[PDB]
Design a protein around this ligand. Structure first.
Ligand SMILES: Nc1ncnc2c1ncn2[C@@H]1O[C@H](COP(=O)(O)OP(=O)(O)NP(=O)(O)O)[C@@H](O)[C@H]1O
Ligand SMILES: Nc1ncnc2c1ncn2[C@@H]1O[C@H](COP(=O)(O)OP(=O)(O)NP(=O)(O)O)[C@@H](O)[C@H]1O
Ligand SMILES: [Mg+2]
Lengths: 373, 373
């Protein structure tokens, strides 16, 4: 008989025992991510990419919450299964904060050593950064053999050092004049199903850095000491040379061709909702409510919404969004209410619909495939 | 400027603030789901469905942990925005449990009021239960205006009463002789994007109860006092009359026809991974690696794996699967390693490939579509 004994778990212990809920999958798997604009087959562990992207997203959040004035040179380096992110933001405040137990724990150490502790817990309606869960940076270390974070406020330098899988930790304060953040850690391969950060992880990281540079032209991302140039037109042409691009103040969409199924790549603020959500669905619905009547008047053939939808590879970017509620800790599916997404996103469906109706490189393959079948 | 102040939250407060990662979505969205064998478009909040499925999963988990000797009558009732799940299982042990803070609290109250507490935290390679996180019933009690958990081990009735949305809790013990469990909660709609437990949610719960009675024939689930009859043959024929059925000791498969894209409904133990996972991908690979040479030799045509796959509707049921993990708390993607699932599942793909080849009612549409293009 199975021993049903009700146990009690601590936060660190629960996270280590139940990492699947907090970093997504933890075993190497196959996917079809858009690597550098190519729908190629990729094999990787979502946990490691998620942990790296946690710190990268923290740097991007520091950039965006300061209106890109501070934290605009995010030097991300990944060499020999070691991650090392640098940014020139305001950094962790040195102001004292109080734990529920009453113990006095400073800012950086509380942020980088305990979960459910972050600066994104304020008013949600005005939250613009990509962080909401207050867990995670916590996570690398929490999933790391060594994790040293060096913050500087221009007057003090705070070094938070953790080792033995976050079990050992210590924070120290030194006089200094640095202003920024330098988070460098080494992953723990005992948890994940891997032993080394191969070239594929660096390629995925470079792809997200390129996408973030395209999304945010102000921030100058750097990878392994090499600058990253952010231009949307080249990024969209990397998908298909005949892509149709429409930019707005908060929406930035591009339409390509999907010959072997359905494809997409969407970003909300600085979060890669790679499992879609409601924004892509709402945008595509609005586009189709204009295509279907127009294609009816033009080619006089009845086509369903899904038939047209399955032949487009939409790459779409959203900026300055608020209330980005997700459904997974990995934040892979934007589940914000459709009304809020429609209110914030001001994309003109008629413009893109007319643009792709006027082009023979996209509509004609759809028409030919429908007529042949 | 964005006011950046580090805040620290406990388990309950963080769950209330960040419910997205713990009950999936919280805004009523539209999917295309299998309701009563029909690929019907449905509109609902996944949060409430996950909330009910948590208690139902705990009941089924107790049942299987007793090897169906106990908790074999899971009477589930949903009336007037209220859920009442009763079973005749062993019940929660009265044994005292010591929290990390040192406080002494009973087992039922520890399970039903504070999260990260469960009896499923055994050796992760020996979990035969559909629960792994120790947060489920505590989660459903957090989002409940009222919640009464009445348990009995045959010697004493333990009643845990929670009210005003997790803020009020009170446990009591009375001499008694009842042996079983009864979880009755009324969900709180102030957080969810809904107002009442309308008929769609009852339909979804009844469909899941039918599915559970099909995969688990010993448990006599009764919905609103109405017995649910479980027969896999009729359940499969509900989808498609010409469906091909193959039953094994731990795996049950039913293959049909899909005219409007790809559809699937798969179950591992008692969890509806409605976004697929790694087991169904293994099934597809094993089926295609034998079907493709056969169709190539028969009809002298070349068809890709995706083209054949997308024209099928497969219903798959898996039981007694050990060491299963999920990328989300909602458990909608089984992220166990491919090798472990392949070792556990003893599917014979050659048999189903031969059966589908010998049928001219499902393969012929695929071949006709291939010849059309
Ligand atoms: N480069 C940086 N500059 C300034 N502050 C930083 C930087 N990196 C991290 N932080 C702070 O460190 C904390 C990190 O918490 P973290 O574990 O990443 O959860 P989070 O910030 O809420 N994001 P997420 O978990 O993705 O929702 C945040 O409160 C940030 O304020
Ligand atoms: N109705 C019940 N019958 C039998 N055992 C129960 C019941 N409710 C709770 N338990 C036990 O008490 C714990 C608390 O329930 P719950 O909060 O759902 O934890 P859990 O089962 O680990 N949840 P999850 O991992 O999300 O499926 C469970 O792990 C069981 O050990
Ligand atoms: Mg983030």
């Amino acid at each position: 008989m199975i021993k049903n004994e009700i146990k009690i778990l601590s936060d660190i212990e629960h996270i280590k025992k139940r990492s699947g809920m907090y970093i997504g999958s933890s075993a190497n798997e196959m996917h079809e991510r858009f690597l550098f604009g190519k729908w190629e087959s990729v094999q990787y562990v979502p946990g490691l990419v998620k942990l790296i992207d946690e710190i990268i997203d923290n740097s991007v959040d520091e950039g965006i919450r300061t209106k890109f004035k501070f934290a605009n040179k995010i030097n991300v380096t990944i060499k020999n299964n070691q991650v090392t992110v640098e940014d020139n933001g305001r950094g962790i405040p040195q102001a004292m904060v109080k734990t529920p137990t009453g113990e006095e724990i400073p800012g950086p150490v509380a942020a980088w050593t305990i979960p459910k502790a972050g600066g994104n817990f304020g008013d949600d309606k005005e939250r613009v950064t990509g962080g909401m869960n207050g867990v995670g940076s916590s996570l690398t270390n929490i999933f790391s053999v060594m994790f040293v974070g060096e913050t500087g406020d221009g007057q003090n330098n705070i070094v938070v050092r953790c080792s033995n899988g976050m079990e050992n930790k210590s924070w120290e304060t030194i006089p200094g004049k640095w202003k920024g953040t330098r988070v460098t850690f080494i992953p723990d391969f005992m948890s994940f199903e891997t032993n080394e950060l191969s070239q594929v992880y660096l390629d995925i990281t470079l792809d997200r850095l390129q996408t973030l540079a395209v999304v945010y032209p102000d921030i100058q991302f750097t990878f392994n000491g090499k600058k990253v140039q952010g231009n949307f037109k080249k990024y969209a042409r990397q998908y298909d040379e005949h892509a149709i691009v429409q930019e707005q103040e908060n929406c930035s969409i591009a339409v390509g061709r999907s010959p072997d199924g359905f494809r997409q790549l969407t970003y909300v603020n600085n979060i890669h909702t790679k499992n879609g959500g409601h924004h892509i669905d709402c945008v595509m619905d609005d586009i189709c409510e204009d295509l279907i009547p127009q294609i009816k008047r033009k080619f006089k053939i009845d086509v369903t919404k899904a038939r047209v939808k399955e032949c487009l590879t939409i790459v779409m970017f959203v900026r300055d969004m608020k209330n980005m509620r997700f459904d997974s800790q990995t934040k892979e599916r934007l589940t914000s209410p459709f009304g809020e997404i429609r209110s914030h996103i001001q994309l003109d469906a008629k413009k893109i619909s007319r643009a792709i109706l006027n082009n023979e490189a996209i509509l004609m393959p759809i028409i030919e495939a429908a007529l042949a079948r």
